[PDB]
Every structure is written in structure tokens, then in C-alpha cells.
Amino acid sequence: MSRQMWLDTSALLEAISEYVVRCNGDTFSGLTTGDFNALSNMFTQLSVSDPRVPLQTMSNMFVSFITSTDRCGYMLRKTWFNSDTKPTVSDDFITTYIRPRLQVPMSDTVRQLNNLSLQPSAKPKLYERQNAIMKGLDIPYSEPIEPCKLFRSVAGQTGNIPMMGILATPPAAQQQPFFVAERRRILFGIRSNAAIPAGAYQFVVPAWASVLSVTGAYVYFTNSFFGTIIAGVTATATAADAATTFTVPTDANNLPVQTDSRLSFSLGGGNINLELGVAKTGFCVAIEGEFTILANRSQAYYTLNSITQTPTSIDDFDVSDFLTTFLSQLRACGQYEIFSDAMDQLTNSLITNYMDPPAIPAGLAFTSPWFRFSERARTILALQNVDLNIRKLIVRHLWVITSLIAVFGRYYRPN
Amino acid sequence: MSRQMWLDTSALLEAISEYVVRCNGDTFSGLTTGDFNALSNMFTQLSVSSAGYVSDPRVPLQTMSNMFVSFITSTDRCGYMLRKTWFNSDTKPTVSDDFITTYIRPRLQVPMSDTVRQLNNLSLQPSAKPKLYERQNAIMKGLDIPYSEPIEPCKLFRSVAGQTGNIPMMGILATPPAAQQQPFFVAERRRILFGIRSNAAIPAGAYQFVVPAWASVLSVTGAYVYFTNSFFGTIIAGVTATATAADAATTFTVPTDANNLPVQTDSRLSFSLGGGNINLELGVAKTGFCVAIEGEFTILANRSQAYYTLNSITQTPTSIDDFDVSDFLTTFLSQLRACGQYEIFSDAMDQLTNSLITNYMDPPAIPAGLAFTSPWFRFSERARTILALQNVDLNIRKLIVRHLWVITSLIAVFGRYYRPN
Amino acid sequence: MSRQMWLDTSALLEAISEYVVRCNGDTFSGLTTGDFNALSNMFTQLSVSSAGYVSDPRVPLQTMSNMFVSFITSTDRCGYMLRKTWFNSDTKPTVSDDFITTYIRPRLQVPMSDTVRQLNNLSLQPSAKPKLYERQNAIMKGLDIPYSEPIEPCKLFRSVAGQTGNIPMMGILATPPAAQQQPFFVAERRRILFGIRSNAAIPAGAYQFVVPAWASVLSVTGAYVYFTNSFFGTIIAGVTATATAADAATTFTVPTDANNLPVQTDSRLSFSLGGGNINLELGVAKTGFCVAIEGEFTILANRSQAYYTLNSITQTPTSIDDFDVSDFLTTFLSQLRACGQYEIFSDAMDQLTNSLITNYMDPPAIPAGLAFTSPWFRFSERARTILALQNVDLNIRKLIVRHLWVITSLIAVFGRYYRPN
Amino acid sequence: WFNSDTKPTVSDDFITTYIRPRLQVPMSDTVRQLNNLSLQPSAKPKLYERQNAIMKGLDIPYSEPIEPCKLFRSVAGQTGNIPM
Amino acid sequence: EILIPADQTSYGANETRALSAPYLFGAPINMLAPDARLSTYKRDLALP
Amino acid sequence: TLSNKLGRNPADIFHLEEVFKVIEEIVSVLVQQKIDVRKYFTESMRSG
Amino acid sequence: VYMSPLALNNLASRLLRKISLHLVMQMVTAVQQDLGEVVSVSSNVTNP
């Protein structure tokens, strides 16, 4: 029912997993490990000689629900995502498993108190993402992320990974500023077949990267991008060369380049002022460190408000990493095909309720399956005849439904 | 006793380790943490043959290790463990030996413990760097590893007819080419990559890559697939990374996904290398190319048995990893050096290794030409050697390796608290 | 009070964090979790005032940060913590301050806490990213760090007679060579690099390498050693990665192991760079070569003291990391900016770091040439500066860096829940 | 009625008198599963089995034989079996 | 002004300043002015 | 002290009464007088 | 059992005979005097 209710339960299910991982090989005969005692109590909080059974039954009852428009339709409606409003639907899967689970207000005052903790989870639960993408809640200040995910398309650059083939082609004349991103580092620079004078150059931080923040960073010169050679740039020096530094609105001091120093600075300024101390026949600066999302600004990323161009490049909020299991089970009992056809309607029908009048918009053909979300997200964000905003929601919304599947379906086994 | 009994106990020692870590700096006075109670309860269960309650672990833990070292040092005692039977069956043997009777005995709860193990392969976020237990079970009973557990493909590499090595190929991939050479399928830590290198352009068309036996069990999620010229930070020659915004899109296909998979796109892909062959449609001609798949790799469901049982191994010689034992030995080694026993211990393992190998081939005699290049703890290299004996049929060589591994693992677990003085 | 009293409380707050992370999204209606139980009890231990169940743990956690900032700013109050003796002896100071009274006192159970701690260094899988508490202890009391905790080589780096830096040595490694230069030793995040660059081919034979002071602490397991030409992604010129199936084997040996270690091979190795030197034997002459060791890096037993004490430092000025403090400050900073105090804080800190250095040099005055090139939270740089003062001798410099660090961390921990209003 | 197990609010002499839960749960199902795995299943199965197949999309016994010509459906090339 | 919120008294009633001001020196019940005249002497003897 | 030499809180293992009985016996020897821990912690002044 | 009123009654009659509860309570008079005051001191007019 309530979107909240679905989230709470998702969380509980996610918790059941967490603890099952905690109990693997820690289930001895003479003890009852605090973890197992909790796991036992969660299993029970769902409806027990075999936990596989109830868990299975739950997944099974789920697939047959999410797989039928007539039942789960209410979830695909526009309102479900928008409000915490009571659903009119009366289906027993919902009544059986979906209902409030989290203590309150405590459960919240904790996740709040969290954001400020020193060492947040490296690999967050879907719950947290779900909350951001849906209610626009804050992510932990100290949570690391690979910047290349944060990437969206902008004015000058069409994409990120595609620029690779270009940065590998010798230049014709001094080109324009490039700003790419990897898994563990941010790259920016200016290529040219002819030396660039020494002086001051101004770089503008793309709307997407303008959220990053780095700590423990080694900022130096390089000619590599994803393990691919960046031609038209040469990182070379001499113990003599004058000092090359840069500055950001954020910090009033000069930050060195090519130094064995751990730097802390944020790209929240919107621009990066570089001071090249020596002329270079093509230069590319690299920022390698720990990237977090600036406090209070994770919104942009998850609201898809990070997007301005059409079409655009987009990631899947890591969802693809959670489907792995559910898929494996689908392949195990031949449902892989069946489920996909059913999902296609789920998606088709879902888009429908978003545009008035209620009809699949013209020119809509998916080039990928339901679980390659990163792609389907694009295709949907590529419809020209559809308003842009409602286009973003369709992705946001479609994401949650997908995440939900990734969580609830895991124990599926019909036979 | 039972191979199971050892595993069980090992699992417990590992649990103890885990909880010692959990409790570190979380032991505040006036507060009995649930974690600390569990840690405490485990200690008790360790010295269960001599106590019903434990004050401080410093001692029994030490004692256990000391005795253990004194055990796998003497062939006379731990001999029963080096026989072909101990690795095959769960027959409760009878051994009159203080260490075995006092510490090695049933620890896991059956069947509830197994149930949880299964429910785990299905979990959303399994441990990224799992315990030795899991590995021990895989390598010995050939059980399944979690579906979502990430792995570094390069470890999975084994030798196949085409290319003999993985890292060795780095040297050739760097040497400019003469003709349009055979396709190469090599792998790194965080990404797998293949392609064809030539000195003359390749006709933009349709090319088929056969996926090597070792990699035919991989699966990726959150993967970017791009064109590249490096391999472990080493430049590859006979490959173009050049491309234009005008170029015709290049895509590949897999026998699993009926849809085409884009290349040089910002889309995070999900596909599986199981099923057969990768069909790559090069949209624009290129003078040598290298496709790279960089993402999260996991072994496919029910296929881990290939890796951990040594079924990936098709020919001899072959290069193989060590299942990471070396990353665990660290501690026990550092403790051996701390009291200069590192010397004697080696001479003992050598004796063990030999005595073990012996028991596998009939008639009972060290094979001819058995020369070890590395010490007991450089397993990787020693397994290669065992696997390279042409006079012993394959299946037996594998067993030698699998069996020797378990014992090595056990040592890495049980010895850690060694301090004789 | 006692330096120990501060650490103990930090560890508590740092523990409260841990459990807050554990309880996030695991707080259900009818459940009682050992984790939440721990947490709610710890919430109690903060305030000497009251012990009732905390309905809103935000309140006291805030009151505490606020009280702390208000304390750490006024030099009249937190002055005693800037004395030479506070970082040295465990002598309870005769100071009366509202903060210290309400929040600082011994909290770790003794002796148990230490027992657990040591038992931990021997644990199999220690935390891959340690709490601050661990460093606090190593940097201040010189305690041991877990025998198998990983570490990124480059952090470990320090300046040596031969080469000035690490990161900067990159640009030079790029420029083709004039003629056969002197050996280089650089370190990345996940791998160590050494070799000799030349424009002219250098003969096949034995070559001796002196491992640096900062890297003689390292030890690796699960390692692949090969010939590459990249450093941090940048191309190294004056080195070749070429080779052929015919080339003779290229082995290297270390004093700690009496066996040859193969290079450019698929086998995973483990060896100790604490032997003092590497002996490489090129099987075939190469026009400039560069060997790479990529594996799991760990700091040898009883040697982490060199890194955390700043004893690995021999030159001046020197390249010095920050022991990762930067990574913990993040939260506090973002919370400062939130209420507009990022400014006013930097000024109170500069007074702190200054007034601190003062007490360190007899006679009692600021040194000449104290040119702070960066703000209080870019520690890595401020350290280089303190360590570059020719006035004060090395020791006093080092001591100041350490003392500064501890204070820095202490803030990174206590500030976080700061909200003035 | 075909898509869900929702107890209908309908009072009709028939339904009341004859239509009522009659199978022992969960035993019935486990016996059924245990069956698909058995050696010689019924060659001419009950409608029940088919009902559960067509309606709930449940499995049929692994060793149950069938005449392939029934399995036949139309595909691109051939629009029929007997017709050919 | 509320000196003590009712929920913090065993007698469930707010403690306003107006409920203190008319009595004695007119200081709030929680901050009554103490007679520290013999303070130093007590402290030495080690009395409370 | 009792809990230190024991390793945990006596109450985690024994009935509070049994623990108190020990504390009583001890404390009483330190002050020469049958002391009763119980009475100090009553519900109110009226209920024992 | 549920087919016959006699049978059911007999079984119930028996099942209940075994319950044996023993609770521990404070002195009534004490509680009623304490709560008593709490009311009197805070009520403005005879509280029912």
C-alpha cells in the first residue's frame, strides 16, 4: 500500500539479508549469537524449523503480484509515488506482507544522526537510495561515491566514456576544455598540438561534478584516462619548473599540483582556477582521492535534476548490482523470458498513467531488457514529445519499482 | 577427526577472530555488549573440554596454537590427516592425541547452520572478502559460493590451448605486430579485456570471439565497456583507441541477452559470459582493437565448482592462483619469525607436503623429478609444481593440490596465537 | 584530563558512531537488537547528568559538540592540552573545567580492553579502514597496529637522500632519458615500482637495489610482479615492456627468502621487503626496465612505529601524508559551514596550532619563518611546514606534528554533532 | 476470481454447501512436489494437475509423458501441423 | 518565562518566573541565591 | 571489585539476592556493622 | 472434544485447575497513600 509501507518492508527484508550474512558460519551449537537471535525474530516478524519456507512463499506470492497489472496497478499510478496517501486496493499479498515496520520517531532520528557518523557504509543498502530518489532525503555526508556515476550530459560534452576515443586522437589545433571522470578520479585539462603559454586559465565545473568534494587527494599531471592514452597532452617536468597551482572559491589558499600532499577541497565552487607555471604542449590535471557528495546537495543526483540535455547519459543508481541474484533465480526456473515480457507491460503501463491522454507515446521502443535500467532510463529520458519533468519522474518511479523487485524476488522458486 | 570436525572448529576460531575484531575498542566498563558476550561464549566453547566458563582468553588461545604447531609438525601425530581417506569421507576416525581430542570436535549446529548457508548465496550484499570457511567448503565439498560475491577475474584464469598465460601475455601485447595475430582474451583485477591486434586496419564487420573455459563462468553488473590500449598499466601495441563522434556505433552480443550491447557508451551494462561466444560488430574499421569490460564480476550460479575444484584446468603445465591463502598466512608467519621457528617450520611442512603427496600415488613413493621451487607458504607456485608432474594422472594431481590447500588453510587459522617461550 | 581520558572518550564517541551506522534502517517495531541495545546504552554513558532512556539522542550529542567547540576554541580553557607533558605523561592534571568534568573520564574496561586489542593484531581479517582510535594509540603511545591490516604504500612514503619525492618524480619518469640514470623507487595506491631507466640497452645480469627506509617496512601477499611502464596512469619513458616466449627467466630474490621469485609470471607471491634490498637478475638485456609489485600491502610486525612516529623521516624538507585525518574531518567541516563558523574556527585553530608550537620550544616563543601555506584541515601540508623549520631541531618538530595531529583528530570526532542555535 | 485467492462475499446455497477447503495444507503441496520427482507418474493424469498448471502455472511431473503433437502451436514458417 | 517544564517535575505543572518572583529576593526557584559565607571553611574541612 | 575479579556483572550470572548477600558480608566488615543494601533502594519512603 | 458439551466442559474444567500464579506486590496502603498525596497536592478540587 502506502509507498512508505513498501519501503519499510523492503528495509526489513534488506535487514533479514544483512543478518543472514552476519550469521553465515557463526551459527554454533552451544551459543545463540546476538545476531542469530535477531535474525530469528525478524523471520518471525514476517508472517520455524526452516526459514527457507516462509521466505520462499513470500517471494513467490510477490512475483505473481508484481507480474499482474490488474493487481499491482495501483503502484504504477502517478499518485503512489507522490503521496503518503492511503491506497484503496485490497489484495492479500499487500495485507500479508506490506505494512509499517519501522519504529518511530526513533528509526528516523537515527538515520539523521547517521549522516554525521565517521565511517558510513561503503556499499549502502537500496533503502537509502530509495529514500533519496523518492522523498529526497539526505545521504551520509561522509559516504564515498565513484564520480563517473554522477556524470550527466552538458552543453559542450555529449558524454564521458565516449570522449575517450577523442582524447586519444592527436589534436588539430588548441581545443576546448575537457572534464571527464573515472571510478577513482576526476580529470580536467586542455589538449593542443602547439604549446600553451604559462599563465592563468579558468575552468568551469560541470553542473554534475559541482557536487563532489575530495579528501586525501593527490592532484597531478597525467596522460591516461581509464587506462587509455590521452594524446595531445604531455606531462613532463624538471626539478626546475616553476610551481603549478590552482584555487577554488571554497578555500582561500593555493593548492599545489605534482606534490606528495594529501589535499582537501570541494568542487562546490563552480570553477577551478589553474595557474600553469610552465608552458606545456598539452596538459591534463588529475584529482585522485576520496569523493563524497557535498552535504545537502545529493538531491541533484537522485532527483535526476542533474540533467539538462536531451538525450543524456545516465547510470542506474547501482540498481543493476542488486538484481544479480533475482536474475539467477529467474534463469533457474525458465521464468526469465516470461518475467521480462511481463515487466515490459509493467513499464509500458507505468509510462501510460504519466501522460494525458492515457496512451503509449509515439516513437517508444526499448533497445534493452528491463534490467539494464541504465539504458532504459535513457530511452525514456529521450522522448522529445513528452514533457521533460514527467519524463524524469517516470525514471525515478520506474527505479523504485525495480529496486523493490531486486529485494523481494530473491527467494523465488515455484516448482 | 572428521574433515568436518576440523572445518567446524576452524570456523569457530574464525568466528572468534571476527568477534575479537568487533569488540576492539568497543569494550567499555559498565556495559556488556551483545558482541562481547558472543565473543566470550565462543571462548568457553573452545576450551569446552576443560572449562565451563572463561575469564581471560589470552591463555587458552595461546595454548591451543602452541599445541597445534606441535601437532602439524610431527608426521607421527598428524599423519592420519595426510591420507587419501581423510579428504574423501566423513568417517569418524579414532586418534589418541591430546590436541585432536581436546580441540577438534563438532561446532556447527546442524542442520540450521546449512540452511543459513544456503539462504546466504541468495543475500543482497554478501561479504566482499569472505572467510576461509567458505573457501574451505568450496575446495573440499565443492559447495556453492554466493551469487553476488564479487571476484577478481584474473584469479580465475587458467591455461588454455591458445594463450598459455595471462600475465606473460603482457610482454607480447606490448611488442608491435607483424601480421593480424590470433585474438587475445586476457584479464586484470577489476576488468576483463579482449581484442585483435594487427599492423594493418581490420575491415569494419562481424567478428567472433570464443570465450575461454576459465572465463565462461563470469558475470558482470555495473560495467562500462570501452576501447583501450593498456593492460595492467602497460601499453598494448597494434591497437587503435581513436574514434570520431561520427563513427558508426559498435556493439556486441551474447547468447544470453537477445539484445545488442553498446560499446564506448556511458551506459552501465549487465551480461553474462556463459553460454558460448561473444559476437562483436565493429562499426568502423580499426588498425587493431581492444575491448574492455570493467565492472563488478561474480561467478555464475552453480559454477564455482569449476574454479575451486580445479576443473577449469584443461592442460599441463598451467598457471593457477592460490585461492588467497597467502593473504591469511601473514599473521602466522609473522608469529613464526617472532620466535625464530620460521626455519624449522619450513623443514616440517616440506616433510608434510612430501609425506602427503606420497600417500596419493601407488606404489607409495615420491614421484620422480619432484623439485619444489618455492616454500610451503607460496602455495600458488607449489601447486603449479604439483600440477606439472607428467607421470601422475591429472585427477590425482588436482586432489593433491586441493587437499594440500585445506591443510595450508588450517595452519593459517590455528597457528596465529603461537608463543612457546 | 589525562591524555588517556581523552582517547577513552573519543573511542566511545567513535564507537557510538559505529553503532549508529549499524542501527540505521534496522530499527524495527517489535525487535530488540543487540546493536540497538548497545547504542542506547552508550547514549547514556555520555552525560554525567542523568541516566534515563534517551528519547531523542540528538539532544545530548549536540549539547556535547557545542560544549566542546566552546572549549576547544578558548585557549584559557583547553590550554593544558597544549603542554609538552600532556602528550607525554599519564599524570591527571589539576584543571577544573565544565567540559572536562561532564564528558571526560576513563571509560574502557581494564585490563580486558588491552587484552582484546592485542589479541586483535593477530586476528585474520582486521578492519580494512580502522577507527581513529587505533592511530591515536600508535601516534601517541606507539602501540602496534594489526599484523594483517592493509595499507597503501604511497602514504607510507617519505623523502630519501636519493630522490626528493614520490608523486613529483613522475614528471621526470616521463621525460626520455639523457643516459642510463640512477634507480628509482616510487609507490602507487595498490602497487610498488622500482627499476632503472636508460636510452641505451643495459646488459643482462645481476643488479642490486637498495630498498628505501620508508619501504623496508612493507610486506606483500597475493602479488603479481611484472614489467610495466606506467606510474599513476602516467607513461614512463626510457623503459621497455617488450618480451618473447624465448626470453630467459627474470628472477629476483630477497634476503628473507632463500628462493628465487619469478617475474612476469601468473603465480601469486608473498615476500618481505624488510630484508634491506632486492636482487634482480635480468635474463635478457632491456632498453630500460621497470618492475612492478602489485598485491596486498601490509606493514611488517613491530614496524608500524616508524610510520606513525615520523621516524622514517631523515631529510628536510620532507613529503609527509596525514595519517588519513583529512578523511574524518569531512563531516565536521560540512557542519561548520552549515552554521557559518568555518571562518571563525580557522582563526581559533591558528591560535591553537601556534600557541602549541610555542610551548614546544625553550625559550618560549614563535619561531622565525613560520609561514603557514595552508589551513588547519589540510594537515598534510601544515605538517610539511612544521617539519621544515630549520630553527628547531628535528625531534621537537616531529613531536609537534604528532601532538598537533592528536588534537586535530580529537576535533574530527567530537565536533560533528555541532549546531549552535 | 481467476487471478487471486480472495474470499468472495457471495451467499449461494450451492457454494455454501459444497464448495469448501478440502485439502490438507501444507502436506498436499509437499506431496505434489515430491511427486514430479518420482519414477513412474500417472500417464493419464487427473484434471486437477492440469488445472493447477493452467491456473497457477505450477510444474508438471518431470517424467510424465505427452504426445508432442498437442504441444504444437503455430510459428512463422508453418501455420500448422496437420495441414502440412 | 518557563523555568522548568511541567514534564520535568513530579507534580506536573510548569514553573514560571511569575511563580518565583514574588518570593524572597525574587529569584527563580532553580537559581536561588546561596549563602556562601562559610564556603571556604567548608571546602577545607571537606564538607559538601 | 566483585565484578572485576569476576569478569562481568555478577547479576549477568547470579540472582541479585545472592550477589547482595556477598556485598553485604563484605561492606559490613569494612564498617563493623550489619548493613543491608536492600533498604537503601526502596520504591518510596512509604514502601519498602 | 468439541463435539460434546460435556466433554469440552470436562477438559476445560481440568486444564484450568493447574494454573498456579503467585505474584509479589507492594503494601496496598503504602501505594494508596503515596499516589494519594500526588493527587491532593496537585488537584484543585476533589479529584474523582
The CATH number covering residue B233 comes to: 2.60.120.170
E strand or H helix at B289, and its extent? strand B289-299
What is the C-alpha separation between F38 and F20, in angstroms, rounded?
8
Q: Closest residue of F to G31, CA-based?
A: F47
> Which chain E residue's Cα is nearest to G41?
E11
Number of H helices, E strands in chain D: 4, 0
Kindly state whether residues A157 and A291 are assigned to the same domain. Answer: yes
Q: What is the CA radius of gyration of chain G?
A: 23
The Cα–Cα gap between A176 and C388 comes to 40
- Vertex B327: Cα angle to B321 and B329 (nearest 5): 110
Contact C335, C414 (CB under 8 A): no
Phi-psi category of B62—alpha, beta or left, where left has phi over 0 and alpha has psi -120 to 50? Answer: alpha
Whole-Å CA distances, C218 to B412, C151, C230, C332:
20, 9, 21, 33
Three cell numbers, residue C194: 622500482
SS3 B348: helix
Contact C268, B322 (CB under 8 A): yes
Measured between CA atoms, how close is F7 to chain B, in angstroms?
A: 6
**Residue/partner pairs of B18-21 with CB below 8 Å, 24 or more apart:** B18/A26, B18/B131, B18/C123, B18/C124, B18/C125, B20/C116, B20/C119, B20/C120, B20/C123, B21/C120, B21/C123, B21/C125, B21/C126, B21/C127
CB–CB of C265 and B165 under 8 A?
yes
Both C316 and C396 in one domain: the answer is yes
Residues B217 and B342 in one domain: no
In the structure grid, which three cell numbers stand for residue B39, read together?
Answer: 565473543
Task: Find out whether the peptide bond into B111 is cis, omega within 30 degrees of 0.
Answer: yes
| Cα gap A84→A1, rounded to integer Å | 9
Interface test mutation site (partner B, options A17, A23, A26, A149, max chain B beta carbons within 10 A): A26
C-alpha cell at B240: 587503435
Say which residues have a Cβ less than 8 Å from residue C41's Cβ, sequence separation at least 6: B31
Last residue of a domain, one of A296, A322, A347: A296
DSSP state of B420: -
Q: Which residues contact C383 (CB under 8 A, 6 or more apart)?
A: C320, C322, C401, C404, C405
Query: CA C98 to CA C68: how far, in whole Å?
Result: 10
Contact yes or no for A69/A346 (Cβ under 8 A): yes
**Which triple of cell numbers denotes residue B419?**
608463543
Residue C169 CB neighbour total at 10 angstroms = 21
Give CA–CA dist B343/B346, Å, rounded: 6
Q: Are strands B289-299 and B218-227 parallel, antiparallel or unpaired?
A: antiparallel
Examine the domain organization and report whether C282 and C308 are in the same domain: no
CA G5, CA E20: separation in Å to the nearest integer?
A: 71
Angle between helices C342-360 and C325-339 (to 10 degrees): 130
Per DSSP, helices labelled H in B72-225 are 75-78, 84-88, 98-103, 112-121, 132-141, 153-156, 169-174
Q: Shortest Cα distance from C2 to chain B (angstroms)?
A: 17
Q: Cα(F29)–Cα(A25) distance, rounded to whole angstroms?
A: 50
Hey, which chains touch E, using 3+ CB pairs under 8 Å? G
Q: How far is B256 from chain C (nearest CA, A)?
A: 31
Instruction: Give the H or E element holding residue C289.
Output: strand C289-299
The distance of A200 to chain B (nearest Cα, Å) reads 30
Contact B21 C123 (CB under 8 A): yes
Contact E13 G42 (CB under 8 A): yes
Which candidate, B336, B339, B323, B328, places its Cα nearest to that of B404?
Answer: B323
Could you tell me which of C375, C370, C372, C380 has the C-alpha nearest to residue C401?
C380
Q: Which residues of B343-364 are buried (b: 16+ CB within 10 A; e: fewer)?
A: eebeebbeebbeebbebbbeee
> Closest partner residue to A261 among C25, C331, C384, by Cβ?
C384
Determine the Cα–Cα distance for residues A279 and A198; give it in Å rounded to an integer: 5
- Return the CA Rg of chain B: 25
List chain A residues with CB under 8 Å of B267. Answer: 313-314, 372, 374-375, 378
D4 contacts in chain A (CB < 8 Å): 71, 91-92
CA distance B121 to A24: 10
Q: Which residue in chain E is spatially nearest to G42 when comparing CA positions?
A: E11
For residue C321, which of B343, D52, B117, A218 has the smallest C-alpha distance?
A218
Distance CA D38, CA D60 (A): 11
Task: Let me know: does B14 contact C124? Beta carbons within 8 Å.
Answer: yes
Contact B34, C39 (CB under 8 A): no
CA distances from D45 to B245, D51, D63 (A): 63, 11, 12
Question: Phi and psi of A11, rounded to 5°?
Answer: -55, -40
Q: CA torsion angle for C72, C77, C80, C83 (degrees, to 10)?
A: 60
C368: DSSP letter: T
**What does the block give as the cell for C62?**
549536540
Q: What are the distances in angstroms from CA A343 to CA A10, A67, A98? A: 19, 7, 21
Local structure of residue B369 (DSSP, 8 states):
T
Considering only CB atoms, A162 lies closest to which of B120, B264, B296, namely B264
Which residue range is the domain that position C169 belongs to? Answer: 146-302
Residue B164, C-alpha cell as written in the block: 598459455
Contact between B44 and B53 under an 8 Å Cβ cutoff? The reply is yes
* Residue A282 CA from chain centroid, whole number: 33
CA separation for the pair A178, A159 (Å, rounded): 11
Instruction: Among C247, C271, C302, give the residue marking a domain's end.
Output: C302
CB C307 within 8 Å of CB C316: no
**Which positions in chain A touch C14 (Cβ < 8 Å)?**
118
CA distance D38 to chain A (A): 14
SS3 C160: coil
**Using CA atoms, how far apart are residues A345 and A362, in angstroms rounded to an integer?**
16
F46 vs chain G: nearest CA distance in angstroms?
Answer: 5
Burial (0-12, 13-18, 19+ Cβ within 10 Å), B388: middle
Nearest CA in chain D to A57: D26
Which 8-state DSSP code applies to residue C216? T
C294 sits in which H/E element: strand C289-299
Residues C152 and C137 in one domain: no
- Classify A252 as helix, strand or coil: strand
Strand partners, B253: B279
* Omega before residue A311 within 30° of 0, cis: yes
Does the CA dihedral C145-C146-C147-C149 come out positive or negative? negative
Answer whether D28's CB lies under 8 Å from D34's CB: no
The SS3 assignment for E4 reads strand
- Domain check: are A343 and A236 in the same one? no
CB contact under 8 A, C268 and B28: no
How near does any CA of chain E get to the CA of G34, in Å? 12
Cβ contact A1:A87 at 8 Å = yes
Q: How many CA atoms lie within 13 A of D28 on its CB side?
A: 8
Q: Which of A296, A312, A337 is the last residue of a domain?
A: A296
Contact B186, B194 (CB under 8 A): yes
Q: Are C338 and A295 in contact (CB under 8 A)?
A: yes
Q: Do A119 and C27 touch (CB under 8 A)?
A: no
| Radius of gyration in angstroms for the set of CA atoms belonging to chain C, rounded to a whole number | 25
Cβ atoms of B254 and B210 closer than 8 Å: no
What cell was used for C4? 588517556
C-alpha cell at position C239: 623503459
Give the span between the Cα atoms of C267 and D20, in whole angstroms: 68
Place of cell 589551513: C375
Task: Quickly count helices (H) and strands (E) in chain E.
Answer: 1, 2
Residue B96, amino acid: S
Helices (H), B1-95: 3-23, 34-46, 58-71, 75-78, 84-88
C207 and C219 part of one domain: yes
Cell of B97: 592425541
Question: Can you read off the three cell numbers belonging to residue A132?
Answer: 533519496
d(CA A228, CA B243): 12
Coil, strand or helix at B269: strand
Q: Would you say how long chain B is, in residues? A: 421
Cβ–Cβ under 8 Å, residues B95 and B80: yes
Phi, psi of C417 (to 5 degrees): -80, 20
A205 with A272: CB under 8 angstroms? yes
Q: Residue A186 forms beta bridges with which residues?
A: A181, A287
Q: What backbone torsions phi and psi does residue C224 show, to the nearest 5 degrees?
A: -110, 125
- Three cell numbers at B259? 539484445
The span from the CA of C259 to the CA of C255, in Å, is 9
Breaks (C-N over 2.5 A) in chain G follow: none
What is the C-alpha to C-alpha distance for residues B241 and B251, in angstroms, rounded to an integer? 16
Which DSSP symbol is given to B219? E
Indicate if B97 and B240 belong to the same structural domain.
Answer: no
As a dihedral over the C-alpha atoms of residue A267, residue A268, residue A273, residue A279, rounded to 10 degrees, the angle is: 20
DSSP structure class, residue C40:
H
H/E element, A201: strand A199-204
Note whether C139 and C223 are same-domain residues.
no
Q: How many domains does chain A have?
A: 2
Partnered with residue C294 across adjacent β-strands are C191, C224
Instruction: Kindly state whether residues A79 and A170 are assigned to the same domain.
Output: no
Alpha-carbon torsion (C45, C48, C54, C56), positive or negative:
negative
Q: Is A405 exposed, middle or buried (0-12, 13-18, 19+ CB in 10 A)?
A: buried
The total of other beta-carbon atoms located within 10 Å of residue F25's CB is 11
Interhelix angle for A320-332 vs A335-352, to 10°?
130
Q: CA–CA distance from G2 to each of D21, G7, G12 (Å)? A: 20, 7, 11
Rounded to whole angstroms, what are the CA distances from A280 to A193, A197, A237?
10, 7, 9
Q: Which of A104, A173, A181, A179 is nearest to A145 (CA)?
A: A181
CA distance F2 to chain G (A): 29
Write out the residues of chain D at the interface with chain A, using a CB-CB cutoff of 8 A: 3-6, 33, 36, 57-59
Resolution for the entry shown, Å: 3.5
Q: Look at chain F and count its residues.
A: 48
Q: Which of B117, B239, B266 to mutate to test the interface with A (most CBs of A within 10 A)?
A: B266
Cell digits of residue E35:
549563602
> Which of C295, C151, C276, C280 is closest to B378 using CA atoms?
C295
Grid coordinates representing C139 are: 601516534
Report phi then psi at D73, rounded to 5.
Answer: -140, 170
Size of interface B-C (CB pairs under 8 A): 198
- Residue D64 has a CB neighbour count (10 Å cut-off) of 15
Instruction: Tell me if C236 sits within 8 A of C197, measured CB to CB.
Output: yes
Three-class SS state of C139: helix
Count of other CB atoms within 10 angstroms of residue A284: 26
Specify burial of residue C77 (Cβ count, 10 A radius: 0-12, 13-18, 19+).
middle
Q: Would you state the torsion angle of the CA atoms of residues B73, B74, B75, B78, taken in this order, to the nearest 10 degrees?
A: -80
Contact status, residue B116 vs residue A24, Cβ threshold 8 Å: yes
Q: What is the dihedral of CA B119, B120, B125, B129, to 10 degrees?
A: 180
The size of the A-B interface in CB pairs under 8 A is: 202
Amino acid identity for residue B236 in this structure = I
Inter-chain CB proximity D59 and A92 less than 8 Å: no
What kind and span of H or E run contains B404? helix B394-414
- Residues in chain A, total: 415
Q: How many DSSP H helices and E strands does chain F contain? A: 4, 0
CA atoms of A291 and A274, how far apart (whole Å):
20
The secondary structure of residue B52, as a DSSP letter, is S
- Among C9, C32, C122, C230, pick the best mutation site for testing chain B contact (most B Cβ within 10 A): C122
The CA distance from G11 to G14, in Å, is 5
Over the range C371-393, which residues count as b (16 or more CB within 10 Å of their CB) and which as e? Answer: eeebbbbbbbbbbbbbbebeebe
Nearest CA in chain F to G25: F47
F1 touches chain B (CB under 8 A): no
Sheet order of strands, A178-181 included = A178-181, A185-190, A283-293, A212-221, A263-266
Closest by alpha carbon to B272, among A371, A286, A28?
A371
Please state, in angstroms and rounded to a whole number, the distance separating the CA atoms of residues C88 and C91: 9
Cell of F41: 533502594
**CB distance B375 to C266 below 8 Å:** no
A in contact with E (at least 3 C-beta pairs within 8 A): no
Element (H, E) at A68: none
Question: What is the SS3 assignment for B191?
Answer: strand
d(CA C175, CA A241): 13
Identify whether residues C173 and C233 lie together within a single domain: yes
Do residue B266 and residue B331 come from a single domain?
A: no
How many whole angstroms separate alpha carbon B259 and alpha carbon B251? 10
For A5, A10, A86, A87, D38, the CA distances from A83, given in Å and listed in that order, are 12, 18, 9, 10, 52
Burial bucket for residue C104 (CB in 10 Å: 0-12, 13-18, 19+): middle
**Position of cell 577438534?**
B104
Q: What residue of B is the nearest CA neighbor of A181?
A: B266
Q: Give the span between the Cα atoms of B62 and F28, in whole angstroms.
A: 41
Helix ranges restricted to H, A91-236: 92-97, 106-115, 126-135, 147-150, 163-167
Q: Compute the distance between CA of residue B278 and CA of residue B260 in angstroms, rounded to an integer.
A: 11
Query: CB–CB of B58/C119 below 8 Å?
Result: yes
In the numeric block, which cell numbers belong to residue D50? 492440469
Residues of chain B with Cβ-Cβ distance to F9 below 8 Å are 32
Could you tell me whether strands B251-253 and B277-281 are parallel, antiparallel, or unpaired per DSSP bridges? Answer: antiparallel
